[PDB]
Structure formats: C-alpha cells, structure tokens
Design an enzyme around this catalytic site. Structure first.
Site, PDB file in Angstrom:
ATOM      1  N   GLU A  52       0.790  -1.227   0.000  1.00 61.19           N
ATOM      2  CA  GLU A  52       0.000   0.000   0.000  1.00 61.19           C
ATOM      3  C   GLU A  52       0.812   1.262   0.000  1.00 61.19           C
ATOM      4  O   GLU A  52       0.321   2.293  -0.440  1.00 61.19           O
ATOM      5  CB  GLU A  52      -0.893   0.030   1.273  1.00 61.19           C
ATOM      6  CG  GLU A  52      -1.846  -1.154   1.237  1.00 61.19           C
ATOM      7  CD  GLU A  52      -2.940  -1.015   0.189  1.00 61.19           C
ATOM      8  OE1 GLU A  52      -2.880   0.109  -0.519  1.00 61.19           O
ATOM      9  OE2 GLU A  52      -3.824  -1.824   0.056  1.00 61.19           O
ATOM     10  N   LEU A  91      -8.931   4.036   2.505  1.00 61.78           N
ATOM     11  CA  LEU A  91      -9.855   4.671   1.591  1.00 61.78           C
ATOM     12  C   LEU A  91     -10.768   5.712   2.258  1.00 61.78           C
ATOM     13  O   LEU A  91     -11.372   5.507   3.300  1.00 61.78           O
ATOM     14  CB  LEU A  91     -10.744   3.587   0.965  1.00 61.78           C
ATOM     15  CG  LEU A  91     -11.905   4.292   0.259  1.00 61.78           C
ATOM     16  CD1 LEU A  91     -11.468   4.812  -1.111  1.00 61.78           C
ATOM     17  CD2 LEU A  91     -13.069   3.348   0.105  1.00 61.78           C
ATOM     18  N   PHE A 111      -8.305  -6.592   3.277  1.00 58.56           N
ATOM     19  CA  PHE A 111      -7.909  -5.206   3.484  1.00 58.56           C
ATOM     20  C   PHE A 111      -8.128  -4.418   2.206  1.00 58.56           C
ATOM     21  O   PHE A 111      -8.725  -3.375   2.169  1.00 58.56           O
ATOM     22  CB  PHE A 111      -6.439  -5.185   3.838  1.00 58.56           C
ATOM     23  CG  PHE A 111      -5.980  -3.791   4.248  1.00 58.56           C
ATOM     24  CD1 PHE A 111      -5.503  -2.921   3.276  1.00 58.56           C
ATOM     25  CD2 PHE A 111      -5.953  -3.385   5.581  1.00 58.56           C
ATOM     26  CE1 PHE A 111      -5.061  -1.644   3.631  1.00 58.56           C
ATOM     27  CE2 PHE A 111      -5.468  -2.128   5.954  1.00 58.56           C
ATOM     28  CZ  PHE A 111      -5.015  -1.254   4.968  1.00 58.56           C
ATOM     29  N   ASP A 136      -6.202   6.391  -5.295  1.00 59.33           N
ATOM     30  CA  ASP A 136      -5.749   5.032  -5.399  1.00 59.33           C
ATOM     31  C   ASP A 136      -5.766   4.584  -6.878  1.00 59.33           C
ATOM     32  O   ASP A 136      -6.061   5.396  -7.769  1.00 59.33           O
ATOM     33  CB  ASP A 136      -6.450   4.063  -4.428  1.00 59.33           C
ATOM     34  CG  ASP A 136      -7.880   3.740  -4.784  1.00 59.33           C
ATOM     35  OD1 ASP A 136      -8.323   4.231  -5.898  1.00 59.33           O
ATOM     36  OD2 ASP A 136      -8.594   3.100  -4.086  1.00 59.33           O
ATOM     37  N   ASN A 180      -6.901 -20.253 -10.051  1.00 59.75           N
ATOM     38  CA  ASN A 180      -8.213 -19.633 -10.096  1.00 59.75           C
ATOM     39  C   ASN A 180      -8.153 -18.204  -9.666  1.00 59.75           C
ATOM     40  O   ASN A 180      -8.794 -17.330 -10.230  1.00 59.75           O
ATOM     41  CB  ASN A 180      -9.175 -20.412  -9.192  1.00 59.75           C
ATOM     42  CG  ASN A 180     -10.594 -19.902  -9.119  1.00 59.75           C
ATOM     43  OD1 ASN A 180     -10.925 -19.061  -8.304  1.00 59.75           O
ATOM     44  ND2 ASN A 180     -11.518 -20.476  -9.925  1.00 59.75           N
TER      45      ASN A 180
END
Ligand SMILES: [Cl-]
Ligand SMILES: [Cl-]
EC number: 3.2.1.17
Length: 162
Positions: A11, A32, A104, A20, A132
């Site tokens: 981050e 955020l 997160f 972002d 996947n």
C-alpha cells in the site's frame, strides 16, 4: 515479516490525500476515504476519521493509527464472516496473512465472492487455487500485488516479499 509489514509494502505510505489505483481518494497506508469524486467530501471524511481539521494532511502517527484500526477491522471482519472464517481457521500463519491482505484491499464482501478459490484453499489445493485467483479483475488490474499475494498462498512462505 508480518501482516503489517506486508501491507505496508503493498500500500505504501502517503501523508497527503491521493487517489488510489481506481481513482478513489485515500490517505496513509491504503486507507480509503471515499469513492466520491469530491475532494471536499474526502477532506470531510478525513477530518472525521482523525478527529481534527486536517486540511488533507496527516502525520505519520495518525497514519499508523488508521492502519492499526484497519488491520484490526479486517481480521474481525473475517472472523465474523460465515464464508471466510472457516477458511481462515483452516490455514497456516503465513497464508492467513494473505487472506487478510485481500480483505484489506477488496473488502470482505469482495473476497467472500471467490467461492471457488475459497473451497480450494480450504482443501489445501495450492496450485489450483492460485490458478483460479489469477482469473479475476483483481489480478488484471493490480497484477504485481496480486502475484505477490497469490505466491504467498501458493507457497506458504514470504518469499514474494523478500
Ligand atoms: Cl475510520
Ligand atoms: Cl500492482
């Protein structure tokens, strides 16, 4: 390595309001603020989160404080989620950190949606789950971060972060 260190790597840290990867207003260590296009709305949410008139800038300590809350909220969210909890409970320490990172990042709801990868992780079919997980918007939009998380699940080690 640990979860805080891991997320700090993915981050980064910014002390001034920024956008972002999706163009939303964020600050600190991936905190955020709002999906609204309005910077004032952002500033208003910042002030409210910090508890003072910030003017869009916070300190390092303030940043770490939002981070601690956010990591705690993520863990508690997993533990409260009927779909996530059993997965988390079945995993080793390193891999639980991977699940936390994803929550997160995308939120519990988003993660609870990878139904298939979830079942595979729970069954300990590492390579299948990674394949996947890679077939997702998540991976196509933030491939390097996604690859780091995916490797951690695949391997059970912190190698992607060293
Ligand atoms: Cl908050
Ligand atoms: Cl990325």
């Amino acid at each position: 390595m640990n979860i805080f260190e891991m997320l700090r790597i993915d981050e980064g840290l910014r002390l001034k309001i920024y956008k972002d990867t999706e163009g939303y207003y964020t600050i600190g260590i991936g905190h955020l603020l709002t999906k609204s296009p309005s910077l004032n709305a952002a500033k208003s949410e910042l002030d409210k989160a910090i508890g003072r008139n910030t003017n869009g800038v916070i300190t390092k300590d303030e940043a770490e404080k939002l981070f601690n809350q956010d990591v705690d909220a993520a863990v508690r969210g997993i533990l409260r989620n009927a779909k996530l909890k059993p997965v988390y409970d079945s995993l080793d320490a390193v891999r639980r950190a991977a699940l936390i990172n994803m929550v997160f990042q995308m939120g519990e709801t988003g993660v609870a949606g990878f139904t298939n990868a979830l079942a595979m992780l729970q069954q300990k079919r590492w390579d299948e789950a990674a394949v996947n997980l890679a077939k997702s918007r998540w991976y196509n939009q933030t491939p390097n971060r996604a690859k780091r998380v995916i490797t951690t699940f695949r391997t059970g080690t912190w190698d992607a972060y060293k």
